[PDB]
Amino acid sequence: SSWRDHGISYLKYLNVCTETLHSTVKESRRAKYERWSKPCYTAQRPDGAGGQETIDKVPIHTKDY
Amino acid sequence: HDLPEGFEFMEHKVVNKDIHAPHENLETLRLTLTRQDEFLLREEPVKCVTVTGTNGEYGIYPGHAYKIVQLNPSPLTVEYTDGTTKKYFVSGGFAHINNEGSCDVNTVECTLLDDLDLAIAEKELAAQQAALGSAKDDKAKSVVEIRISVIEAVIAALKHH
Amino acid sequence: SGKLRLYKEKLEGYNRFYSIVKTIKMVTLAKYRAAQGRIRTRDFSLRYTELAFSKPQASRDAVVAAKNALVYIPITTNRGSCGALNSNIVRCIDSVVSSKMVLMPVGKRGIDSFSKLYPDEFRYGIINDMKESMHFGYATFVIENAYEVSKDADRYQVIFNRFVSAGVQRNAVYNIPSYEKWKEDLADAASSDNQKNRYLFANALQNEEEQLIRDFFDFHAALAVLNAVGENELSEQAARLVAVEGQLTNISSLQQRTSSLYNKTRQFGITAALIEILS
Amino acid sequence: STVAISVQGLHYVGTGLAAIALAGVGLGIGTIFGNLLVACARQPNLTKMLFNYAILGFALTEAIGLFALMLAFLMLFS
Amino acid sequence: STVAISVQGLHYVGTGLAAIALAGVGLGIGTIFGNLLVACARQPNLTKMLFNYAILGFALTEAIGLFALMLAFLMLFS
Amino acid sequence: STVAISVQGLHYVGTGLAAIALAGVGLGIGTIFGNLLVACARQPNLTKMLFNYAILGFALTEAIGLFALMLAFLMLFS
Amino acid sequence: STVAISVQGLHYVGTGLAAIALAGVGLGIGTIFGNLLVACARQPNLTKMLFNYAILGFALTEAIGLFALMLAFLMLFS
Amino acid sequence: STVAISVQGLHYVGTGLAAIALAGVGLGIGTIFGNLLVACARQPNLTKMLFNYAILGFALTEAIGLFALMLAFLMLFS
Amino acid sequence: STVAISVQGLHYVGTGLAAIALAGVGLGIGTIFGNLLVACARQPNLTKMLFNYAILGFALTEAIGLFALMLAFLMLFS
Amino acid sequence: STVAISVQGLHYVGTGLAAIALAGVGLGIGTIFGNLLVACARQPNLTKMLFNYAILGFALTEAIGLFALMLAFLMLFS
Amino acid sequence: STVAISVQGLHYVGTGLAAIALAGVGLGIGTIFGNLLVACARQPNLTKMLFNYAILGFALTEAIGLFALMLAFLMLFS
Amino acid sequence: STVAISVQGLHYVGTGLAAIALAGVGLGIGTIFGNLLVACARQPNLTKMLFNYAILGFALTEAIGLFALMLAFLMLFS
Amino acid sequence: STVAISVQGLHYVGTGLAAIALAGVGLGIGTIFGNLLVACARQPNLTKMLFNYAILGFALTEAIGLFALMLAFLMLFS
Ligand SMILES: O=c1ccn([C@@H]2O[C@H](COP(=O)(O)OP(=O)(O)OP(=O)(O)O)[C@@H](O)[C@H]2O)c(=O)[nH]1
């Protein structure tokens, strides 16, 4: 609705919807469903020193959108 | 050197009916309900499927015209020819309807309405309403509105039956 | 004195190595058992994605014709010991070297292998901790990063491993053209008698708005990426099992060799000492 | 001069004019049913509801036509 | 003066006006079938039901037409 | 010269013309009870609110219908 | 007094009015075929049933037009 | 030669014509409530603002209708 | 009294009214072709059948047009 | 001969005709608002620009209506 | 008594009534070209064929208008 | 006999008829703006451009009304 | 017996009836430009092309009105 005007893409909207739906699940089943929405992905580039410089091209969590 | 394409390993193709061909009266619809590259139903024959699209609800019966529907967070009903109703809830995705008698509903998340609970939705809605006032900026407000809409749809689906 | 001690010490080391590898085998077998359920539930999500993107095309014209960035998103595993999957992916990438090539690999091994070989064609890589199930959010992250790497990109080629069977892991490709080229092809299919299999699909897409079409495009690209990563994970597990079994066999052979040498050394030393002492 | 005139054949003309109202009535009815079909082809499970509402519409537009008809009779027998 | 006059020919004009009601009725009927097609293409499996409803709509619109015709036949033959 | 006439029968003709005002009125109602159906299929959960709004629109159109009917009756019994 | 006047030409004007009904006939027919095309574009394999239903609708609307023509010819030859 | 005639009944005819405009008003109202419902189905969250805008449109259309009705009534009593 | 009149020019009036029928004919044709284009936009490979059906509908409407024209010619040349 | 006649009540007729010009005006306004609602449902963030354009359209349509009403009042006072 | 009255100014009314028929031809052409514009955006690759079909439809509507003008001129002169 | 009759009030009637033309013009203008809204809510980035075209259409459509209005004045001031 | 009457003021009625035809032309132009505005928002890249076709329609829709307008003069100045 109003999220398009702010530049939020469709995929982020889908991720938010799925996260909310999982949060609405019963206590017992959530243990499974929550495994399909927890962010565990990151962007890295190897620098000269060897440190894995982390990129900020795309937000990982929904609150950062 | 010619690499394959991942679609060659999937032999369950899509049957598209030709333009200049005779009509057939179908009594069942082949449904294919999918969540994150995983199906719950595999070409299951059903009497009808009710899907809540963006413009409005669609009641798909055998022989429906070819169409593409952009789903919204909402319930999805499947009624078999036997007379048994199965209700899911979806958070998003697409529905492809074919005039040959097939309906492929590919959702990001499709979970049984029973699995959902009421009090959890109410408390999450209250928390989102409280956070809306403290939204950092416009984007946070839009995100909280999205979450609130999803929760309201879930609660309405639960209260309906 | 020294020979026997060294042989026994290295034999003990090999024994510990074998035990560690056996534990690794058991853990990987548990993971393979958990992940094998996908096979029943696959090969049905991507049906209209085929119509959206499946196109029998030459491997030369599609490459030379483009004059904008050609993004490549090879799928690679975080941990080694998988086998020849990463090597084959690297070979496939090398065969497709071009001035327009851009790499956004996935996995630590892919990053470490494409950073050195291709420094000027590498921007950054994505990493996922294999803690949760491969979900849609990860695919969306990959797609968003790919777009931000090169928004004016001719195509986005995903290279992954397809797990045909327990012992067969081929290399598969998903090609994701730019929105403009996809729109042109879709319009040609809808109007012209050519592409007769996509005529209804293209006409259905055209009837709808443009935002819906763009959302459809992004959604099916994400689905393709999700399928790729899932198949790559399954293939990685299978190849890890195979390579672990091979390593176990090699370790057992080396332990047998060392035991034979230890027996020979002890007998030789005992007899030599006895002869030179009491004779 | 003060010529009071009573043309007896005019009460036909007015009657006909009243009947023209039915043109906007019948057409309206069609529209309802038209949409009804499109509403049934979208959510057939709701037909038993929609039909009632459609009937209600016909029960209102028709009630309008009667009024016109009433005039078309009052002027046709007076 | 009191000049009553009986112009016979007027009983034709009114009749013609009544016929104009058929302009609506006809159109309305067409509209129904129009939508019917758009419905029968959308969900052919329901054609039968839709057809019945379409007939119902016709059976109503034509009814209005009857009244108009009656008026005509009640003024042409008068 | 100075001349004046009083044609009584004309009081019918106007009464007919006012009746034509109902042609739109009835049609208008149809439009409402058309879209209502299309609205109830898309959002069956909102049948009550849409029905109330349709009743409101029907009353608003009936107001104009009664205005025209008042004009017609006044020109009929005058 | 009462004055019976038998005008001859008034049997023409009414005729010309009845023909106006055909305006609401032809348009309706157009509508039908219009929708038909759209239907054949949406469900082309269902062309035969749509064609037959459109023919039925055309027959009914043409029957209405034939009634109007009956009235027109009755007045023209009267 | 000069003949000045004051026909009294004509003031009825015009009055009726002034009422015909009401149709174009009444139909319009339905159109508003024909689409309002759809909007309420498309975006139920805006059930309030859309209602106010529709009321504004109805008020303007009713102002037009009253402007016509003033002419209708002035000629009925003069 | 017993009286009888015959006006020569009235046969013009009716003729014109008959021509008004064509207003509902030509428009109808446009409607058809309108929809035709839309159909040809979403089913380019089914153009021949759509064109044939459009021609059929045009001829069917032209039948009504020719009926009205025949009435007009009968009232203009006699 | 060279006869000349002036009729008094004719200005009531023409005036009424001008009032019919307000039928398409009011209807037009409704149409605007109709579409407006749909637009506000499709793009709810544009609740003010669309309102401004609707007001502009109403102003132009009302200017046309006032052009007609000027004639309607002027003939009524001639 | 018998009166053979020949009014010399009645052909203007018939000519105007016939000219009214162009209100349908113009609207039909407008509908044709509106649908043409809608279709070209939908499927721009077929612009030429759609243009040809629209030209055909316009030619047919213009033929109808030519018939109406033939009647109008014939009445105006004859 | 042969009488050169000159009626004076007729110039009102014709004038009123001309005003009926505006009933279309007004309506047409509304249609434009209607679509304009549906076009601004479908691609707001083009709003300004769209607005310009809309104005152009008005400046054309309005012109037609002026023609009709001119005729009215010519007959109303003669 | 044979009586010849030459009414001088009847050309006003015919001129107004001819002017009535401009309503259809205005409505057609409005429909054309509304469809243009809708289309451009769907395929902006081709806007210019669409515009040309729209103008063509106007060129082919205004001309008809001219003919009607022409008749008006041919009766207003005669
Ligand atoms: O201005 C417009 C025009 C059209 N559309 C959109 O274009 C599409 C045309 O779709 P259709 O007209 O072909 O189908 P439909 O009546 O079944 O539509 P739905 O109920 O399924 O929506 C529909 O999805 C409509 O919402 C707009 O969103 N805005």
Characteristics of this structure?
hetero-oligomer of 13 chains, A: about 60 residues, alpha+beta, two-stranded antiparallel ribbon, 2 helices, C: Pyruvate Kinase, Chain: A, domain 1, 10 helices, 5 strands, binds uridine 5'-triphosphate, hydrolase (chains D, E, F, G, H, I, J, K, L, M), transmembrane (chains D, E, F, G, H, I, J, K, L, M), hydrolase activity (chains D, E, F, G, H, I, J, K, L, M), lipid binding (chains D, E, F, G, H, I, J, K, L, M)
Strands, helices and their partners?
The complex is a hetero-oligomer of 13 chains, with one copy of chain A (65 residues), one copy of chain B (161 residues), one copy of chain C (279 residues) and ten copies of chain D (78 residues).
Chain A: H1 10-23, H2 27-33, E1 41-46, E2 52-54
Antiparallel strand pairs in A: 1-2
Chain C: H1 3-35, H2 38-41, H3 48-53, H4 61-64, E1 69-74, H5 85-95, E2 101-103, H6 108-117, E3 125-128, H7 136-149, E4 153-165, E5 168-177, H8 179-191, H9 199-207, H10 210-278
Parallel strand pairs in C: 1-2, 1-4
Antiparallel strand pairs in C: 4-5
Chain D: E1 2-7, H1 10-40, H2 47-74
PDB class: membrane protein
Keywords: ATP synthase, mitochondria, membrane protein
Assembly: tridecameric
Describe the structure.
The complex is a hetero-oligomer of 13 chains, with one copy of chain A (65 residues), one copy of chain B (161 residues), one copy of chain C (279 residues) and ten copies of chain D (78 residues). Chain B folds into two domains: 21-116, no CATH class; 117-161, no CATH class. Helices cover 24% and strands 37% of the residues of chain B. Chain B has helices at residues 118-133, 138-160; strands at 29-35, 39-46, 48-53, 57-60, 67-79, 85-90, 93-98, 102-107, 110-112. The radius of gyration of chain B is 19 Å and the shape is globular. Chain C has 279 residues and is of the alpha/beta class. Chain C has a single domain (31-240), classed as 3-Layer(aba) Sandwich (Pyruvate Kinase, Chain: A, domain 1), CATH 3.40.1380. Helix content of chain C is 62%, strand content 13%. Chain C contains ten helices and five strands, in the order H-H-H-H-E-H-E-H-E-H-E-E-H-H-H. Chain C starts with a helix and ends with a helix. Chain D has a domain at 24-74: F1F0 ATP synthase subunit C (F1FO ATP Synthase, Up-down Bundle). Chain D contains two helices and one strand; from the N terminus they run E-H-H. At the H-J interface, strand 1, helix 1 and helix 2 of H face strand 1, helix 1 and helix 2 of J. Strand 1 of chain D pairs parallel with strand 1 (2-7) of chain F, so a sheet runs across the interface. Chain C: Its main location: membrane. Chain C: One of its GO terms (cellular component) is proton-transporting ATP synthase complex. Chain C: It holds the Pfam family ATP-synt.
